[PDB]
C-alpha cells in the first residue's frame, strides 16, 4: 500500500504464503478449520523468524572471523515490546507479509495485536536499552545485550473503582517464538559460602550453586542484514539440589525464584535480598560468558582492546569486583594489573540524581551473600581513598564524602561511588543532567578525575517510534525527501524548506487527524469511552511519580473545569486530557494520584454543562504497545517535571518526532529539544534549576501560594471538602497535606506560569495552520534525538569503535 | 540393512536428508561447524515428527466425522521411555533414516542414546499404560490416554558406596519435541471451599482455583496411519492468584507444585495431601474435557454409548463422585439417572492385593479438600449398603465389611470399594490374581454382583519389546514366517515347526550371543566393569520390594560362592548374576537390600579363587531404556515372588519374548506362561498359593529352616558376623532380624527348592542345543502375552467396541 513498507513482489508473496501454510500444518499442527486467530499469529511469526536465522548465523560467523572489539551492554531491564512488526520493518517485509496474509483472507494488523509485549522493564531506563540494541545493530557494532529472562515482567494494570490493581504478566503463557534456549551454554553462579586464605591466594568455598541458562533473541539492524544477540539468563537449580525426597524436589523453586519476577519500581531503590541476588546472577553469568568468548579468539593485556562493558545504571555494578575476583583469584593476575584491565573495560551510565533511587547496599547483606566481593570492595576503597588523600592532603571531610563505604546506623556500600572508581568513563544522559552531576553529587569525583566525566544525550529509535507506529507520517515525509532519513534522522532538517508549502501543511494535519480518529475509535472498541476527535489531545503518559508532577496537570484540569462552571456560555478550546502510567505497588502517594485522576474524570465527564468541551481519561495499562498507539495521536505533550529531577526523559522525544507540540519545564532533554527547534516553537514555563535552588535556600512555603492565588485556593478547598469524593469526604487528605506541608517538588510554585502557558497553547490551537507550521518546525529539528546519534557517540568517545552503515551479504 | 526395518528408497532418503538440514538450520539455528550431537538428535526428531502430523490431523478429523465410541484411559502414570525409535518403527522409517543419517556422516544409534526417557511412571503399572496406548492405536480404537505432565519423573538412581542416591529427573531440561502445548484448552480445577444448599440443589463455593493446561503427545499405531493422543495436564496458577506484590507472584509456585513431581512409590500407599490433589487434578480436568467433546458431537442417556472411562487402579477413583457431581449439581440430572450413567461409563482395573498398597484416604482430608465429593461418597455408600442389606438381610458384619467408610482411629474411605460400587466391570490382571480377588479381598462384592468381575491377563507390545529392542531376533523370525506376527503375535506358534531345524537353532543361539557381547561391551564403556560373555546371564530386573524377593536371589548367590570356596577345583557353570531396580526413597529395607547386593559383589568379584566363574553386578538406574538393552541379552529370567503377591508381572513376558528361560514361582502371569509353553519348558519351583495359606494357618517359623538346613545356617552366620561388611560388622542386622523373626514373604520356605531348581538350570545350560530348543518353545508360545490380545479383550468384553486392523489413508 505505502512505499516505506517495502516491495510486495510476486515471488516473495507466493513464498511467504506457502511457508505460512507449512508452519500452520507442521509447526502448529492445525488446519484452516480448527485454527484460532492466535494460531495465525504464530504461523506468521514463525514465517518471519525463518528470514532472520540465515542472517543471524552469518552475522555471528562474521564476528568470529573478523574478531572485532565486542560491546557488552549489561542491564537488569530490556523493555522490548512486540517483535513481529519491528522484525518486518527491519527486513523490508511489511508489504509482502501484508499482501500474503490478505490473499490468505487474514488481516495482519489484527494478528499483530495478539502478540504480548515483552515487558521486561519499568519505563525509561528499560526502553532506552531496547532502543540502544536497535541502534547498535543498525550501526553494525558487534554488540550483545545481557540481562535476565524474567518469567513475569511489569504487572498488568487494571483500574477497579478508580484504584490500581496489579496482575501477573504471564507473558510466556503461550510461548515465545523469538527466543532460542541455549542449555549447552549453561553456567554456574555462586552464592553465600566463606573465604579461605591459602598460600596461593584467596578461595571462595562452601557456596550454594545456581545454574544460569541462556536464551538468545535476535536483534535485526535496519536493512543491513546484521542480526545481533540479546542473551537473557534464566535461573535453574542443579540436579542434586537438596539431594524428604518430595520436599527436596519442591524446594528447587527457591533457587529458580531468582529469575521469576521484575521488581516493579522505577527510579526507586528497594534494598531486598532477592534483588541483590538478581544483580549478582546477571553479572556472574555474563562475565564468564565474556571471558569464555575472549579466550576463544591467557594474556589479559589485550582484554580492554577486545571487550567493552557498559553498566546501565548501578544495577550491574558488581561487574567491577566480580571482574577483579576472576582476574585475581582465578587467573592469578596481580592486583594492580587486574585493576588496570577492569577500569579500561568498564564504563558507567548514571540515570538519576534522586537520593531515593541511589543504590546503597547494607554491608551485612553483602557479607553473608557475597563475602569475597565485600573484601574486594574494601580493598578498592582503601586504594582509592589513598589516591584522594595524596591529591588533597589533609582534606578529611572529602575522604568521608568520597568513601565507597558509608558509615551510620547500618554501614552501606555506595554503588555509584564503586562505579566511578572502577570505570574509565562516567556519563549522564542529557546535557543539563551531566552538568548537575559534575556540580553536585559527583563534584568531588569530577575534581579528582575530570577526564572521566562525559555527556551522552539520550535518543529513541526512529524505526519503532516513527516508521512502525506512524506509517502515515513516515510516508508523507518520504514523498518529499526520500527514505534515507530513517537511518539518518538529521535529514529531517530538509523539511524546513516545506514549512510554507501548503500541500505539506495539509498532509501533516491530515495524518494527525487520521491518527486521532483511529485512536478515538480504539477507546470505544476496547474501553467503551466516548471522546471528541476535534478536541486538542492533551497527553501525559509516563510512570506515576511525584517528581513527574501528574498533580500539576490535575490542578490545571480542575482550573479549566472551574472556569467553565463559572462562565458556561463562554467559548473554550475543547480538550481531551489523557493521563496514563503505572504506580509502583508500594508507592502509596502515586496510587492516590491515580485515584484522584479517575475521581476528577468521574465529576468532569458527567457534568452536562461541560458537554464535550472537557474530558479526562485515565489510560489504563500504559506500556510500549499502548505508547505506539497514543503518541501518534497526541497534539500536546506534557513534560512538566520539577527542573533538575528528570535526568533526560525519552517520551518527550517520541512526541516531538510524531507531530505533537511540547509544554514543559527546562528539565532533562527538554532543554536540548527547545534549543534544536527554537524556544519560540516550544511552550516553556516555570522555574529553572537555579530558581529551585533559590527557593530551597529561602525555604519553600506552599501556604504563600494558597494565600495569594484565589483559583488555587478554590481547588484545595474542593479537594478538602470532598467535592471529588462525596461519599468519602476526607479521601484526598493525604494529597492536600503533602501539597500544603511537605511537597519536595514545588507543585504550587509553577502553577501560575503553567496555567498561563496552557492559555497560549489553546490560543495557537485555534489557528490550525500556524499550529501545524510550528509542528513542522519541531519534526524537522528532531534529528539529534535519534539513538543512532547517541550510540555513535558512545562508540567513538567511550568504547573506541567505529560505527558502520555497510551491508552484510543477504 | 535388515528387512523388518523397512525400505530405504531413493526418493525417501533424499527427502529426509533435506528436511534434516532444514531443521538444523531453521529450527535449531545451527550449522555443521557448531552443531553438537544433541543438535543432531533434535534435527532428526523434528524430521521424524513432521511425518506424524499429517496422520495425526487426519486421524482426529476421522474421529470427528465418524463419531465412534471414545475410550478414556485414566492413569497417574505413563512410563513411555524414548519416542524416536518407536516412532520410526511404527511409521516404517527406520532404514530410510538410518541410510539418510549415514550419508550425512552420522550414526543413528548414537543419536538415539541422547533422548531422555519419559519416566512418568514407577514400574509395571506405568509401563502397562504405555504398552496399552501402543496397542489401542495399532487396533484402531478412538482412545485417549489422560494423565499428569510431571516436571520431574522417576528419580535417577546413583550408587554411592553401595548405597542408593536419588537425583531429580529434569527430563524437560533440553525441551520435549514430541509434545504440543494446547493452552487454548486450559480448564479450571477447584479445591477446598464449602458446600451451600439452595432451592436448586447444592453449590460448591469459595474454592481455590488451579488451571489445568493440556500438552498433547502423538501415539502412532503400527503401520496403520492411526495417530492417537496422550493428553497430559500441567498445573498453572490463575493471573490474579494472591492478587506484598513480589511474594504474591512467588507464591504462584504453590499452586503449580501439583504437577511438579511423580510420587516415587510403587505398590505402596502414601496418604499425603499433595498426592490427593494430583489425583483430583487429573480427574477434574479430564472429565470436563470428556463432557465438552461429548456435547460437541443435553441428553446424557447416550453418554455411556459414546464414552468409556477406564480407571487404572484406584488412583483416579474420584472420577466416580466427580461425574456424579457434574451430572447432579451442574447438569441437574436426578440421582438415580446420574448413577446409571456413571456405572455404565466407568470400569476399574485392580493391580494389587497387598494391604499396604490399597488407597484408604482419611475422611478429614477429603472433608477439607473436597467437601462436596465427601458428601456424594456418603450418599453412594448409604444407597449401596441398602442394596447389600436387602440382598443379605440381617448380615450386619457384611455391611461393615463392604462399607466404603472404614471406622476406626481415623475414619477412612476405601477407594477400591468406591470403584467396585461405581463401575460396571472390575478386572484383575492375570487369571490367578482375578481368582484371588473373587475368593478373598472382594469376595463379598463378588457374591453381590458376580457379573461385574472379569479377568484381563496383561500383555506387552511386541513393537517396543521385540522389533525395537531385538531387531536380530525379529529378523531371523521374519525370514521363516514373514512379518505378519508383529501385529498378530499368535503367528509365532508357526515357529514350533522349526524346533528341530538345525539352521534356526544356530541362528537363535547366534542372536543371543551377539546381544550378550554388545551388552558386555556396554558395561565396560559406560560403567567400567569386566564380565565373561560366555557365562549364563542370570538377571532379575524390577523394583526393589520385599515381595519380589531379591533376597532369595542373594541367598542363592552366596550359596554358589560358598560352594566354590569349599571345592575350588570343581567345575561349575559360570554365571553373571545381574540385579537391578530402584527402591522407594523412604523404604528402608529395600535400600538395605541394594546395599547387600553391592556388598556381595564386593566380596565375590574380587576373590581370586572364584575367577570369572561368578560375578555379581548391580545394574544402576534401571529404567525402560536400560530394559531394552539388558532383556535381549538375558539367558535366565528371575520371577521369584512369593505365590499370591505379584498380581501379574510384565517383565516376565518381555524375557519370554526375547529368548530367556524362566525360573519362577506359580505366581501372577507365570502360571499362564508355563501353561502356554508347557511346564517341562519352564523352571517352576516353590510354594503354590495353597501352600502359603497352609503355612500361615500353622504359623511361619523361620528358625525351623535355619535349624535343618546347614547351608542356610552358614549364610545367616556370615551375614551376622560381618563377612560381607568387615568394617561395619552389624550392618545387616536388620536384614537378619527380619528374615529370622518377621518375614511376611517366607524367603526361607522356598530356599531349598529354589537352589535345587537352579541346579537343573545349570545342567541344561551345559547342553547349548537343548537349551536353545527349549528357548524356541518359549518364544513360539509367547503370543498370548501381546497387549494387542489384552486390548482386544477389554474392547469386546468391557468397552463394547470392535477393534480394527484396517489402514487409514496415508
Ligand atoms: O536514561 C533513561 C531514563 O532513565 C530513567 C530511569 C532512571 C533510573 O535510575 C531508574 Cl532506576 C529507572 C529509570 O526509568 C530516568 O528517570 C529518565 O530521566 C531517563 O530518560
Ligand atoms: O498390572 C501391571 C503391574 O502393576 C503392578 C503395580 C500395581 C499397583 O497397584 C501399583 Cl500402585 C503399582 C504397580 O507397579 C503390579 O505389582 C504387577 O504385578 C503388574 O504386572
Swiss-Prot record, chains A, B:
SUPFAM superfamilies: UDP-Glycosyltransferase/glycogen phosphorylase. Pfam families: Phosphorylase. The record marks 97, 131 as: Involved in the association of subunits. Phosphorylation of Ser-3 converts phosphorylase B (unphosphorylated) to phosphorylase A. GO terms for cellular component: skeletal muscle myofibril. The modification N6-(pyridoxal phosphate)lysine is found at residue 654. The modification Phosphotyrosine is found at residues 192, 215, 446. Keywords: Acetylation, Allosteric enzyme, Carbohydrate metabolism, Glycogen metabolism, Glycosyltransferase, Nucleotide-binding, Phosphoprotein, Pyridoxal phosphate, Transferase. Signal peptide: none annotated. AMP binds at residues 31, 64, 292-297. Allosterically regulated through the non-covalent binding of metabolites, being activated by AMP and inhibited by ATP, ADP, and glucose-6-phosphate. The activity is also controlled by post-translational modifications including phosphorylation. Belongs to the glycogen phosphorylase family. This is Glycogen phosphorylase, muscle form. It comes from Oryctolagus cuniculus.
Amino acid at each position: 500500500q505505502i512505499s516505506v513498507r517495502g516491495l510486495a513482489g510476486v515471488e516473495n508473496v507466493t513464498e511467504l504464503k506457502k511457508n505460512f501454510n507449512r508452519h500452520l500444518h507442521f509447526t502448529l499442527v492445525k488446519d484452516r478449520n480448527v485454527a484460532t486467530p492466535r494460531d495465525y499469529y504464530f504461523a506468521l511469526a514463525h514465517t518471519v523468524r525463518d528470514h532472520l536465522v540465515g542472517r543471524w548465523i552469518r552475522t555471528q560467523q562474521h564476528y568470529y572471523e573478523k574478531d572485532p572489539k565486542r560491546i557488552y551492554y549489561l542491564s537488569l531491564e530490556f523493555y522490548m515490546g512486540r517483535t513481529l512488526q519491528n522484525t518486518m520493518v527491519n527486513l523490508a517485509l511489511e508489504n509482502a507479509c501484508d499482501e500474503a496474509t490478505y490473499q490468505l483472507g487474514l488481516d495482519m494488523e489484527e494478528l499483530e495485536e495478539i502478540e504480548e509485549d515483552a515487558g521486561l522493564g519499568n519505563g525509561g531506563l528499560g526502553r532506552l536499552a531496547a532502543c540502544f540494541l536497535d541502534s547498535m545493530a543498525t550501526l553494525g557494532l558487534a554488540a550483545y545485550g545481557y540481562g535476565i529472562r524474567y518469567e513475569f515482567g511489569i504487572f498488568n494494570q487494571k483500574i477497579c473503582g478508580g484504584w490500581q490493581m496489579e496482575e501477573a504478566d504471564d507473558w510466556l503463557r503461550y510461548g515465545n517464538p523469538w527466543e532460542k534456549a541455549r542449555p549447552e551454554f549453561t553456567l554456574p553462579v555462586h552464592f553465600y559460602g566463606r573465604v579461605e586464605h591459602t598460600s596461593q591466594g584467596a578461595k571462595w568455598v562452601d557456596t550454594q550453586v545456581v545454574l544460569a541458562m541462556p536464551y538468545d533473541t535476535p536483534v535485526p539492524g535496519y536493512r543491513n542484514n546484521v542480526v545481533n544477540t540479546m542473551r537473557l539468563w534464566s535461573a535453574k537449580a542443579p540436579n542434586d539440589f537438596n539431594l524428604g525426597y518430595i520436599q527436596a524436589v519442591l524446594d528447587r523453586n527457591l533457587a529458580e525464584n531468582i529469575s521469576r519476577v521484575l521488581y516493579p519500581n522505577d527510579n526507586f531503590f528497594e534494598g531486598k535480598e532477592l534483588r541483590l541476588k538478581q544483580e549478582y546472577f546477571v553479572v556472574a553469568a555474563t562475565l564468564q560468558d565474556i571471558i569464555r568468548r575472549f579466550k576463544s579468539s591467557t594474556n589479559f593485556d589485550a582484554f580492554p582492546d577486545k571487550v567493552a562493558i557498559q553498566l546501565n545504571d548501578t544495577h550491574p555494578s558488581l561487574a567491577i569486583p566480580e571482574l577483579m575476583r576472576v582476574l585475581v583469584d582465578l587467573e592469578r593476575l596481580d592486583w594492580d594489573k587486574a585493576w588496570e584491565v577492569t577500569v579500561k573495560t568498564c564504563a558507567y551510565t548514571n540515570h538519576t540524581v534522586l537520593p531515593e533511587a541511589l543504590e546503597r547496599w547494607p554491608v551485612h547483606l553483602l557479607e553473608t551473600l557475597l563475602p569475597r566481593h565485600l573484601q574486594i570492595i574494601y580493598e578498592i576503597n582503601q586504594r582509592f581513598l589513598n589516591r584522594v588523600a595524596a591529591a588533597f592532603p589533609g582534606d578529611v571531610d572529602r575522604l568521608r564524602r568520597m568513601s565507597l563505604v558509608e558509615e551510620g546506623a547500618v554501614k552501606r556500600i555506595n554503588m555509584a561511588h564503586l562505579c566511578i572508581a572502577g570505570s574509565h568513563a562516567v556519563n549522564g544522559v542529557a546535557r543539563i543532567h551531566s552538568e548537575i552531576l559534575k556540580k553536585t553529587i559527583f563534584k568531588d569525583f569530577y575534581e579528582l578525575e575530570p577526564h572521566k566525566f562525559q555527556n551522552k544525550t539520550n535518543g529513541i529509535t526512529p524505526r519503532r517510534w516513527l516508521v512502525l507506529c506512524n506509517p502515515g507520517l513516515a510516508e508523507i515525509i518520504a514523498e518529499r525527501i526520500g527514505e534515507e532519513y530513517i537511518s539518518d534522522l538529521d535529514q529531517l532538517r530538509k523539511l524546513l524548506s516545506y514549512v510554507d508549502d501548503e500541500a505539506f501543511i495539509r498532509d501533516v494535519a491530515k495524518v494527525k487527524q487520521e491518527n486521532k480518529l483511529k485512536f478515538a475509535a480504539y477507546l470505544e472498541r476496547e474501553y467503551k469511552v466516548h471522546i471528541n476527535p476535534n478536541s486538542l489531545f492533551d497527553v501525559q503518559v509516563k510512570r506515576i511519580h511525584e517528581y513527574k508532577r501528574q498533580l500539576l496537570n490535575c490542578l490545571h484540569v480542575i482550573t479549566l473545569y472551574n472556569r467553565i462552571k463559572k462562565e458556561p456560555n463562554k467559548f473554550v478550546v475543547p480538550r481531551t486530557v489523557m493521563i496514563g502510567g503505572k504506580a509502583a505497588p508500594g508507592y502509596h502517594m502515586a496510587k492516590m494520584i491515580i485515584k484522584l485522576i479517575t475521581a476528577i474524570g468521574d465529576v468532569v465527564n458527567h457534568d452536562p454543562v461541560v458537554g464535550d468541551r472537557l474530558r479526562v481519561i485515565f489510560l489504563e495499562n500504559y506500556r510500549v504497545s499502548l505508547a505506539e498507539k497514543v503518541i501518534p495521536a497526541a497534539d500536546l505533550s506534557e513534560q512538566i517535571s520539577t527542573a533538575g529531577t528528570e535526568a533526560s526523559g525519552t517520551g518527550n522525544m517520541k512526541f516531538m518526532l510524531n507531530g505533537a507540540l511540547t509544554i514543559g519545564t527546562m528539565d532533562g532533554a527538554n532543554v536540548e529539544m527547545a534549543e534544536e527547534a527554537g524556544e519560540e516553537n516550544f511552550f516553556i514555563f516555570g522555574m529553572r534549576v537555579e530558581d529551585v535552588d533559590r527557593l530551597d535556600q529561602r525555604g519553600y512555603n506552599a501556604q504563600e501560594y494558597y494565600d495569594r492565588i484565589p483559583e488555587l485556593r478554590q481547588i484545595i478547598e474542593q479537594l478538602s471538602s470532598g467535592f471529588f469524593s462525596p461519599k468519602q469526604p476526607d479521601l484526598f487528605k493525604d494529597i492536600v497535606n503533602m501539597l500544603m506541608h511537605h511537597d519536595r517538588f514545588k507543585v504550587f510554585a509553577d502553577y501560575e506560569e503553567y496555567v498561563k502557558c496552557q492559555e497560549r497553547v489553546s490560543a495557537l490551537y485555534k489557528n490550525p495552520r500556524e499550529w501545524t507550521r510550528m509542528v513542522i518546525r519541531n519534526i524537522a529539528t528532531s534529528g539529534k534525538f535519534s539513538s543512532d546519534r547517541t550510540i555513535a557517540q558512545y562508540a567513538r568517545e567511550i568504547w573506541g569503535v567505529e560505527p558502520s552503515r555497510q551491508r552484510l551479504p543477504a
